[PDB]
Amino acid sequence: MISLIAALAVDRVIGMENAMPWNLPADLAWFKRNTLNKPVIMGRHTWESIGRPLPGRKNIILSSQPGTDDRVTWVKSVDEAIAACGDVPEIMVIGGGRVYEQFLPKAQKLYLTHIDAEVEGDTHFPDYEPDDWESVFSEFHDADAQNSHSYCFEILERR
């Protein structure tokens, strides 16, 4: 099974200038909780944005060019990325925009954080078709001293 996990600001913005400008520790904790001990697939720009391997996960990087770091696994196509995960229950696709576009048609589950924040951005999560997806979990949180925006954690499963 393939799942996508992402945090979306208003208008499905996910990034600006190869960064995420907000800081929501509770959402990073949710990301870790849902990805630990699973393979994670990311594109090269997201690898550079994170800037180091994510511990406790098999890190697989998509790039058309040869890899430059043997602490992670480098692959050259979608099918190779999936194969490099092996026989696991759940593969997590962690972006960015271009990568999410390619894996969306293959995904059964979306783990989305909707952040109440207006962000100028240059990268968006794919327009997906709402009729294709059933919301199976949602949990809203108001802003607090550690998290400066309200946010909603949602899990959607392909109908």
Ligand SMILES: NC(=O)c1ccc[n+]([C@@H]2O[C@H](COP(=O)([O-])OP(=O)(O)OC[C@H]3O[C@@H](n4cnc5c(N)ncnc54)[C@H](OP(=O)(O)O)[C@@H]3O)[C@@H](O)[C@H]2O)c1
């Ligand atoms: N809010 C969130 O949840 C979230 C999550 C992830 C990322 N982001 C943000 O998203 C932005 C990065 O997204 P992006 O769309 O610019 O880039 P991306 O999807 O991370 O990376 C694109 C790169 O991945 C490689 N690639 C993708 N598909 C490939 C394929 N089928 N075969 C071979 N290589 C392939 C290519 O690398 P080469 O050029 O080397 O061939 C391509 O240039 C940043 O702002 C980041 O902060 C946000």
Ligand SMILES: Nc1nc(=O)c2nc(CNc3ccc(C(=O)N[C@@H](CCC(=O)O)C(=O)O)cc3)cnc2[nH]1
């Ligand atoms: N829900 C969600 N939120 C995000 O912010 C997110 N970001 C990315 C891409 N960017 C990043 C940037 C940093 C880390 C990161 O350092 N994660 C640590 C958390 C511990 C910490 O630095 O506080 C990790 O171990 O996963 C992960 C993804 C991909 N999917 C996401 N999904």
Ligand SMILES: [Mn+2]
């Ligand atoms: Mn091929």
Ligand SMILES: [Mn+2]
């Ligand atoms: Mn197999």
Ligand SMILES: [Mn+2]
């Ligand atoms: Mn949203």
Ligand SMILES: [Mn+2]
């Ligand atoms: Mn806000």
